[PDB]
């Protein structure tokens, strides 16, 4: 199917506790493959997936140089945006950046993106046409003019529709044994009595990849969005994901409720029902 | 591979 490569950058100022904390991570789909931490002793881009370890020394040299350079510019930008928003040097602030590319099954460019945040809110984003910017406020409009002058969009577009897609293709091939796998959800249902007249039905999906999954409860074949608890999809820590959905049902009405599981790995959607 | 064309905000 379709695949993505995404880089995430976080810079956090820490007044009177040294220069900003910088953490960079690289992902192919839901699999992390590189990290950099400004606080770590290595001061190198580090591998986090087996299949990136087959890149040569020139790869690690360039990635280390370019990730450090990104942290340096983001350090300057924290100072500039603090100026734009008339904020004290005494307060901590956060710049977050995400950029990357999507490809289809054929490995051809699908879309590119770059989004920038300040203190957890949209600051500036490259539009889908990769030619123009959306600035969130009057501070971001100054950045927009600077970025237009320096042809940021033109250079970023060449990266996103070229370099990004080329290296994503390369990573998908080298890591194909793990990246192009689909682990379907192992599914079961549990019954937990609350009182004499109530019980919890919990529908489980375990050990699945990728992360994207839909768990929904129906009563008499009718969607039950209300009286439902749906926890966020969570990592198992072994490269697979877990999720569950729960309904509070009257005692002796368990057979009325069905759980519906949709995942890439499943040939067709699974229907589960309580089995005493 | 990382993008290397760094423009200040």
């Amino acid at each position, epitope marked *: 199917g379709s695949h993505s490569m995404r880089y995430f950058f976080t810079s956090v100022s820490r007044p009177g506790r040294g220069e900003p904390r910088f953490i960079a991570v690289g992902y192919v789909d839901d699999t992390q493959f590189v990290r950099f931490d400004s606080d770590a002793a290595s001061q190198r881009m580090e591998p986090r997936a087996p299949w990136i370890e087959q890149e040569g020394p020139e790869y690690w040299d360039q990635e280390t140089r370019n990730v450090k350079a990104q942290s340096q510019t983001d350090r300057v930008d924290l100072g500039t945006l603090r100026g734009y928003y008339n904020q004290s040097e005494a307060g901590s602030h956060t710049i977050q950046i995400m950029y990357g590319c999507d490809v289809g099954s054929d490995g051809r460019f699908l879309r590119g993106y770059r989004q920038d945040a300040y203190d957890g809110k949209d600051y500036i984003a490259l539009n889908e046409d990769l030619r123009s910017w959306t600035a969130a406020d009057m501070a971001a409009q100054i950045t927009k003019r600077k970025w237009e002058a320096a*042809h940021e969009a*033109e250079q970023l577009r060449a990266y996103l529709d070229g370099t990004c897609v080329e290296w994503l293709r390369r990573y998908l091939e080298n890591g194909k044994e793990t990246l192009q796998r689909t682990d379907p959800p192992k599914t079961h249902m549990t019954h937990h009595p609350i009182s004499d007249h109530e019980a919890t039905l919990r529908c489980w999906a375990l050990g699945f990849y990728p992360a994207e999954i839909t768990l929904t409860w129906q009563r008499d074949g009718e969607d039950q969005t209300q009286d439902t608890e749906l926890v966020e999809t969570r990592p198992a820590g072994d490269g697979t994901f877990q999720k569950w959905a729960a309904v509070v049902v009257p005692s002796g009405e368990e057979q009325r409720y069905t759980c519906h599981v949709q995942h890439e790995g499943l040939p067709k959607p699974l229907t589960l029902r309580w089995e005493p | 591979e990382l993008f290397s064309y760094l423009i200040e905000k």
Partner: T-cell receptor
Amino acid sequence: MKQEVTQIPAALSVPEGENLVLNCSFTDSAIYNLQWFRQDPGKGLTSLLLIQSSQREQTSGRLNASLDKSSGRSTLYIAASQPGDSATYLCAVRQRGSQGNLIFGKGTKLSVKP
Amino acid sequence: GVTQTPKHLITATGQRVTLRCSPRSGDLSVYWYQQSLDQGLQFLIQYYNGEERAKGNILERFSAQQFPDLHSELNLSSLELGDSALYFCASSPGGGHNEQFFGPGTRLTVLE
């Protein structure tokens, strides 16, 4: 490939008023931009034109420059050359994936004779 | 804007010299270039906001730094005859991907 910038001719002595052609070739086509400088004794380098990888040409007064990235070629045209144009003309590129350092040709030593 | 001191240096082989550069007021980047007769202009090393950003084809006996005030020093040790060149400092308001403003250069002569 290893990026090498070469310029023809190495030197050019011409009478003023002539339209001049200064040639530049580079081995590797993966460049962010190509920049033309003039160098004068004891004054260092002054930028003439900056051509983006996406741009075909740039103009600045009597100066016009073309960029054929695939061919690895750039041409600087000096219209109605004046004695004040006398300098070393330097062709330089910046590599994609690098942090902006210039890779220089050895230059064309231009003498425009009054 | 970009100043370089000293303008001229005459020393013997094996000696050590320090080349000084001050960028344009407010500029963040400092680039060092060596212009010799054999290789022309060659990138040595570049700094951004007081930290090394990139290193060229530079020898171990060649070292440099950018100080908190963003002025830079280039140290050339165990000098050889082949080190005779014009040493240029260039500064940039940003990373230097678009603009590099060159100082007047420091001319070094190494003799027997």
